[PDB]
Paper text:
In this study, the flax cytosolic cytokinin oxidase/dehydrogenase LuCKX1.1, an enzyme involved in the irreversible degradation of hormones in the cytokinin family, was identified as a potential virulence target of the flax rust effector AvrL567‐A. Cytokinins are responsible for the regulation of cell division and plant development, and have also been implicated in plant immunity. The crystal structure of LuCKX1.1 was determined, providing insights into the molecular basis of the LuCKX1–AvrL567‐A interaction and the action of the effector on LuCKX1.1 enzymatic activity.
To obtain insights into the molecular basis of the AvrL567‐A–LuCKX1.1 interaction, the flax LuCKX1.1 protein (residues 44–534) was crystallized. The structure of LuCKX1.1 exhibits a two‐domain topology consisting of a flavin adenine dinucleotide (FAD)‐binding domain and a substrate‐binding domain, which is similar to the known structures of AtCKX7, ZmCKX1, ZmCKX2, ZmCKX4a and ZmCKX4b. The FAD‐binding domain (residues 44–243 and 478–532) comprises one mixed β‐sheet, one antiparallel β‐sheet and flanking α‐helices. The other domain (residues 244–477) contains an antiparallel β‐sheet surrounded by α‐helices. The residues important for substrate binding identified in the active sites of ZmCKX1 and ZmCKX2 are largely conserved in LuCKX1.1, including aspartic acid‐168 (Asp168), glutamic acid‐281 (Glu281), valine‐365 (Val365), glutamic acid‐369 (Glu369), tryptophan‐384 (Trp384), proline‐413 (Pro413), leucine‐446 (Leu446) and leucine‐483 (Leu483).
Numbering used by the authors: 44 to 133, 136 to 301, 307 to 528
The structure:
Amino acid sequence: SLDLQGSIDYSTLAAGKDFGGVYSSNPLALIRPSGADDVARVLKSACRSSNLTVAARGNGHSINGQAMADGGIVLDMRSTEGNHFKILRIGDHYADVSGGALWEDILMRCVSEYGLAPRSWTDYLRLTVGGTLSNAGVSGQAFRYGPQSSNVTELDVVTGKGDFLTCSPTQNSDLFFGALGGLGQFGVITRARIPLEPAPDMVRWIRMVYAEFEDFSRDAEWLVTQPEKESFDYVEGFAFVNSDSPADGWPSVPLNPIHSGHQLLYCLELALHFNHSNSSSTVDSVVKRLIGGLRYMKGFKYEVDLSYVEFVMRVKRVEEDARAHGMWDAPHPWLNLFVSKADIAEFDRLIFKGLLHDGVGGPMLVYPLLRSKWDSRSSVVLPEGEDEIFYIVALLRSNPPYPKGPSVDKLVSQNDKIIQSCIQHGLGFKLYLPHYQSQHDWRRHFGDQWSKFVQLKLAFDPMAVLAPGQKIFTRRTK
Ligand SMILES: *Cc1cc2c(cc1C)nc1c(=O)[nH]c(=O)nc-1n2C[C@H](O)[C@H](O)[C@H](O)COP(=O)(O)OP(=O)(O)OC[C@H]1O[C@@H](n2cnc3c(N)ncnc32)[C@H](O)[C@@H]1O
Ligand SMILES: [N+]
């Protein structure tokens, strides 16, 4: 039986808002669950109601209201963030972590308490375990280890019916694989067990500028396809504007220019783990071998050494900056997508060069991934193709709020135009963090994976109580 009191221990949380600032909602209530028991109690009660919906909120970083429950119940999963933490040995190591824990705190705790760390990250660490595992969780390690959803050995899940189940690849495996990349549709992740690696002492962080997309992409693909023993430990890249803009021009590139008609340029971003047992000269020798033959513009290679924790935490500086400029609690109509290797050059021509040649005010990430690291059994949707290589693209728009900058309607319209152009060109792409309004568009997104997705919904959340903000299924009555 669900027993609740007024929240005393907690600061105000705007449960009807998220990072995107595109939508707003008015939940009936915000609940701070103590742990999995409370989550189950809440979902069991929701199932008995005629039409209550429940959204589990991670850290509110959705763009499109995915963690909202207008006229429903929001669970603050961070109130469970301390639950379950442990490190165990089998001599491989694992961590149990709460679904509501921030990746930032997992990094700090694992490194400081055990000299260990997760091996697959997001760029930004104030995201929750459950939140990223429900999507994928992608950064520069994914070419080696796969996304965070490919680095899980166990989940505790409370289903939309309110049932608690421990799941793995071999136990309640339909739920396990369904929840991974499953957009919160089948249950609330209350615990994950994840592999850990010995934490590196240090990182050599490198950025190299490219004039042309062909050179950039060929070199990026080369670097993610080398033997593990002779490879970097992180590969990303981004297009930036050939301008003096502090937001997304040349100032955004160095870690601590040639005058040309280029509208955009490209930056290949690499990192090499090393330990204090390695001399600077040794690291130099390794890097020199690894980048032999690369066609980056001479004179525009930037390098710094920093601790592993500082490198994984590198985006904290960006948040501090934004917050100091009152730009954090503002709209961010970001667009994220996966593009097939076969179509990435046309995507660059049509979208980067064609539509975005003046930039979007923030990073335009683009870098290759390896399909073999993305578990085909999961709910993740990738574009068709069987090139081992595919790409992720992220358009991290940043603008002063209206009327100083464009309206949210305007920006969303621009995002729609990008997607429209890809569709009209028949490009092989899928949205990451997908958002659609009609189920017809959702069926187009899932393609031949749709039947399985609905089957899982019927098995685990038949009344569609859970994650209504994804707008895939509507709440059934009674
Ligand atoms: C805001 C932001 C997001 C972001 C990022 C940088 C910033 C500043 N960098 C990313 C990166 O480098 N790589 C990547 O893959 N994602 C990145 N993101 C996006 C982030 O992944 C998403 O915002 C994602 O949603 C995680 O954020 P968060 O943890 O805050 O979760 P949420 O937005 O509130 O909820 C997402 C959906 O999942 C459901 N949900 C939430 N918690 C659970 C649990 N425990 N179990 C089951 N479902 C859950 C929500 O209801 C919602 O549908
Ligand atoms: N070097």
